[PDB]
Amino acid sequence: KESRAKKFQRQHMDSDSSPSSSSTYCNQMMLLRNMTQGRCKPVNTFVHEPLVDVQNVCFQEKVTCKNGQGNCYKSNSSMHITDCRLTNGSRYPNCAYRTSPKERHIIVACEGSPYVPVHFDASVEDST
């Protein structure tokens, strides 16, 4: 039975592939990671960083979760992420995605011992 910690890695981590997401990365990943079962998940974020760096977020900046009633953590650093966004014409099982690499802070909810991310809460785009 899949732990919440492992589910977070499945749904939101990509530490092992090359840093550069190609145009068909999301098409493949959203199927591979089981996010197109019975539905095309509209938007999903994968984090292209080492696992330890993402785990360490759990003792970084304390912020309120978007639900307004929980402790979440914001990464001190902007991280390499890829947003997968469902194309307007897509209908299950033909779930096609736009692949959008970007640099954003991540906000996660953490749990367990060791205390590690179990929920991807939001991302933050710093103004330039």
116 CB burial (10 A radius; 0-12, 13-18, 19+): buried
25 within 8 A of 99, measured Cβ to Cβ: yes
Would residue 105 show up in a list of annotated catalytic residues for this protein?
no
| 36 marked as binding residue | no
**6 assigned ligand-binding residue:** no
The catalytically annotated residue of 12, 48, 80, 105 is 12
Q: Is 91 annotated as a binding residue?
A: no
Strand pairing report for 79-86 and 116-124: unpaired
Asked if residue 45 belongs to a known ligand binding site, the reply is: yes
Residue 85 annotated as binding site: yes
The reply to whether 117 sits in an annotated binding site is: no
Catalytic annotation present for 12: yes
Which residue of the set 48, 80, 105, 119 is catalytic? 119
Asked if 29 and 46 count as a contact pair (C-beta separation under 8 A), the reply is: yes
Give the tokens for residue 39.
């539905």
* 10 is annotated as contributing to ligand binding: yes
Residue 43 backbone dihedrals phi, psi, to 5 degrees: -145, 130
Annotated binding site for substrate: which residue ranges?
7, 10, 41-45, 66, 85
The catalytic residue positions are 12, 119
Annotated binding site: which residue ranges?
7, 10, 41-45, 66, 85
